[PDB]
């Protein structure tokens, strides 16, 4: 009977290349259009590529275009998919499918599928609250930075004026950098950290980021925007 | 004074390579650790890479590791970032930054930044309702498929039993494929489409997908799971 045998599935790391094979028998291979359809574990079907019966016309989905290649060998009766520059999102069960005819409209014969997994290649997460803070000039800003793991006071504070590069304010969670006025003050140890800006100047209205250096890799907080009201 | 001049920013397509330069003056370049930090338009700061003063030790963030490379030329007083296999998410303003010392803990001098954009290289979206449908055997299932654009009845229906490959049920939105019993019936035209499964068999409990072929590229619907209660 009509049959499609699949091979070439396995585990690869991101960036590398994989090639899948779909061996066909029971029908005239060179007279039908051929399809690849993928399905990530859990979610629905995603259409990948189509090739014409002669192999001259090839069409791809937007997500795979430029880095995926559909090909066929009509003397070998085999369909191929070259997968290059592989992302983590490319992790799916890949089905080869024979089209109804040469048209490439819809498929009536499906291969069993081969599993393709792209993985994989500890951190200290910093959370900043609040997200935004509305205040007047003369008012005082209080900013929280919470680490997922104890950092033993190895934390830095950065100011970023809109459109400008970041500027170091506090290093070591207490020490104030050279140039920085004493209305800015860093506080805290372990997991809990605070920046206090007493008597807000118009210059002080900016985005503020905390950065840890107790563990590798170095991470930032999500930021706190201090804006006028 | 202490200065960092940045260049090499621009627009590239996904997959291609870009190299950024950070030219340094006003300090002893070969005695400080060097940082790259990126910021996607709108969101916060993301730490990319660090290089030691001698250039022997290199450390990268998880998202960029394996495809990004940090390097330096101490005779040229220049820091480099080689960006390979570029994703759409890599779109950011890239800052070079001098570390406080050779340690690589935190940075006190920041470059202006260069903008890097990765873009870009019409569709008919199919929506399926409901997501799940709980029914007994003997009951009737009614399934909706809605296209974003009129497809002039060029729609196909697929059944997928759990763990198995998809199986064509209806093509052209009315016609029933060979093998398929007449308790399954497709209906509709233009944008509105329905599959009706009268008197549900135990075999019929599966996931159902609609697929359009009026426009290129070929797209699927999100699926409807028909399950027991």
Numbering used by the authors:
A (entry chain A), B (entry chain A): 1 to 121, 127 to 234
What did the published study say regarding this structure?
Lack of non-toxic inhibitors with defined mechanisms of action poses a serious obstacle to therapeutic interventions for diseases caused by aberrant connexin hemichannels. Here, we report the identification of a human recombinant antibody that perturbs hemichannel function. Each scFv of human immunoglobulins is formed by a heavy chain variable domain, VH, connected by a linker to a light chain variable domain, VL. The antibody we selected is not toxic to cells, reversibly inhibits hemichannel currents and strongly reduces the activity of some Cx26 hyperactive mutants.
For antibody discovery, we screened a single-chain fragment variable (scFv) combinatorial antibody library expressed in phage. The advantage of a synthetic phage library is that it enables full control over the in vitro selection process, allows to obtain highly functional binders rapidly and at lower cost, does not rely on adjuvants which can unfold proteins, and may contain over 40 billion highly stable human antibody clones. Connexins are post-translationally oligomerized to form hexameric assemblies, known as connexons or hemichannels, prior to membrane insertion either within the endoplasmic reticulum or in the trans-Golgi network. Unpaired connexin hemichannels in the cell plasma membrane are kept in a predominantly closed state by at least one of the following mechanisms: (a) pore occlusion by mM levels of extracellular Ca2+ and Mg2+; (b) negative membrane potential; (c) post-translational modifications (e.g., phosphorylation). Open hemichannels lack ion selectivity and mediate autocrine/paracrine signaling by the release or uptake of small molecules including ATP, amino acids, reduced glutathione, NAD+, prostaglandin E2, and cyclic nucleotides, which are critical for cell-cell communication and the regulation of inflammatory responses. Of the thirteen dominant Cx26 mutations responsible for KID/HID syndrome (G11E, G12R, N14K, N14Y, S17F, I30N, A40V, G45E, D50A, D50N, D50Y, A88V) at least eight are thought to translate into hyperactive or “leaky” hemichannels (G11E, G12R, N14K, N14Y, A40V, G45E, D50A, D50N, A88V) that do not close correctly in response to extracellular Ca2+ or show an altered permeability to this critically important cation and second messenger compromising cell viability in vitro.
